[PDB]
From Swiss-Prot, chain A:
Compartment annotation: Lysosome membrane; Cytoplasm; Cytoplasmic granule
PTM text: O-GlcNAcylated by OGT upon glucose sufficiency, promoting interaction with small GTPases Rag (RagA/RRAGA, RagB/RRAGB, RagC/RRAGC and/or RagD/RRAGD) and subsequent recruitment of mTORC1 to lysosomal membranes, leading to activation of the mTORC1 complex.
Family from the record: Belongs to the WD repeat RAPTOR family.
Subunit structure: Part of the mechanistic target of rapamycin complex 1 (mTORC1) which contains MTOR, MLST8 and RPTOR. mTORC1 associates with AKT1S1/PRAS40, which inhibits its activity. mTORC1 associates with DEPTOR, which regulates its activity. mTORC1 binds to and is inhibited by FKBP12-rapamycin. Forms a complex with MTOR under both leucine-rich and -poor conditions. Interacts with (via TOS motifs) EIF4EBP1 and RPS6KB1; interaction is independent of its association with MTOR. (Microbial infection) Interacts with vaccinia virus protein F17; this interaction dysregulates mTOR.
Organ and tissue specificity: Highly expressed in skeletal muscle, and in a lesser extent in brain, lung, small intestine, kidney and placenta.
Residues of the full protein shown: 18 to 50 of 1335
Superkingdom assignment: Eukaryota
Protein name in the entry: Regulatory-associated protein of mTOR
Chain positions with Phosphoserine modification: 27
Its biological purpose: Component of the mechanistic target of rapamycin complex 1 (mTORC1), an evolutionarily conserved central nutrient sensor that stimulates anabolic reactions and macromolecule biosynthesis to promote cellular biomass generation and growth. In response to nutrients, growth factors or amino acids, mTORC1 is recruited to the lysosome membrane and promotes protein, lipid and nucleotide synthesis by phosphorylating several substrates, such as ribosomal protein S6 kinase (RPS6KB1 and RPS6KB2) and EIF4EBP1 (4E-BP1).
Amino acid sequence: EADLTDWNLPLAFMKKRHCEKIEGSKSLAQSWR
Amino acid sequence: VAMMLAQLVSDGSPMVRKELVVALSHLVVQYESNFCTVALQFISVYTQIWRVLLHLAADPYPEVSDVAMKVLNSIAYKFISATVQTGFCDWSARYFAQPVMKIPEEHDLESQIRKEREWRFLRNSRVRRQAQQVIQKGITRLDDQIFLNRNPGVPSVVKFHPFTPCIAVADKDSICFWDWEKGEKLDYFHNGNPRYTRVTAMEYLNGQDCSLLLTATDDGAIRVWKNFADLEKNPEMVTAWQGLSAGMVVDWEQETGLLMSSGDVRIVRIWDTDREMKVQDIPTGADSCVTSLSCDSHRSLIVAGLGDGSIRVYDRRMALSECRVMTYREHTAWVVKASLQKRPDGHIVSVSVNGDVRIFDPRMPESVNVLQIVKGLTALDIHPQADLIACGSVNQFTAIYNSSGELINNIKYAISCLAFHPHWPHLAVGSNDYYISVYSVE
């Protein structure tokens, strides 16, 4: 089935490393102390 | 320890390259005097370190190049004049904030992701399926011209959108998207490469779903782009790197999921997108450079044409000494074109300046058949799964025949590029006059 062949084909470059911006994690307004 | 930096320049991973630049900065901050002296002299570990710094400055990827530009100022003008940092570790640490004890919605068998993927695959399957019915009901003829329009700049290369009635026409540095069903433009983009460079080839990637675009630059570079189809979105780069010195020739294997590259050298190199590291490097074996190259899906046969008129077939499984397996020497001049068919029985089609279109089988050392259209060709095209071959002429004559030579269509237009449509019989022709046209079924 052609659908099966499409399912078998790989998806190049489609991983989180290339797809989303590489930046630091935002700080937060912690006040529990 | 310092000798390790030069080895990782060959990796395609842009993040590794940026971190490598950061490591260069951290190493040079302590021994700046030698690099300052060398740079002032230029206006052997340190010499090669400076050379790889130069290479990283010439990185097509904007971020590594920018970091290199900022870093260089700390040496030439010498106090720490430049400061650098990147957030790889924090982005990685972001991992533990997300849920860990739940199945992602993407793996649910009723989410919209699965539905959209299945529907797109159904569209692709329907497009593929209708081709057999169209072709096998009696050879269809392309008498109906559907699209014909002009654009600024000579059309260097044209490619069909595999599952959408539109084409991408690219030149030295820019791309335009035109829908031949509408006859209207879709979008415009600039590759970004400078005057001293040109685009040697264009290709599509991931045509089954969320297709991307690829460009090869004669500087030995490769670039990838996405979001070039939507009218409401700007295209974005995916990956970019220079790994090699006809200029640059690139082939892709979606089924095998591997990129292969060569050029005006005796070398062929293979890359895997997932690992971002070169997988294999095969010397040409012969003493002549390569002009064109095409290979098979999941099979070891690699077919290449050389500048001495010989055609080589390699078995990439074995060692380099045993790599070569099959040689053809019939044409006298350089190989104008050579291609391998992925049909159930392997076949090879080649043509040279001699004007002899020759068809060979892998298990024989001589051409199975010979035909001629005219001595010297500007465009040659072969249908993937049909008995169809299209050939243009410098005399404004073009035609489509069977592989047996029987004529099917004759046309008079100066043809620069000419190509088929993989599934639904169509023919796209762009002339040296900036004019691009398409012919469709009946």
